[PDB]
Copies of this chain bind each other. A is one copy, B any other.
Amino acid sequence: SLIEELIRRSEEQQRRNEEALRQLLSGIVQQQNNLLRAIEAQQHLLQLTVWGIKQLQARILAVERYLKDQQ
């Protein structure tokens, strides 16, 4: 969502730089901050999914042990 917002802002600045290529240095630097923010927002979500996978591993392990124990 914010990633989607940062991507659209980067898409906008990309069009401005390509049109300005056709002042440009500032937009190029700003575009690099746009991409860095996007990468950082994706890192946050990626970090959440890593933790979500670990919790699913713990849940399935508990079920596997429960079935083992019931035997």
Q: Which residues of A contact B (CB under 8 A)?
A: 3-4, 7, 10-11, 14, 17-18, 21, 24-26, 28-29, 31-33, 35-36, 38-40, 42-43, 45-46, 49-50, 52-53, 56-57, 59-60, 63-64, 66-67
Contacts and interface: CB of A to CB of B under 8 A. Distances in A.
Given A49-B49, A60-B63, A64-B59, A32 B28 contact: yes
Given A17-B32, A21-B29, A25-B21, A49 B40 contact: no
A40 to B, nearest CB: 6
What is the oligomeric copy number? 3
Contacts of A59: 60, 64
B36 A42 contact: no
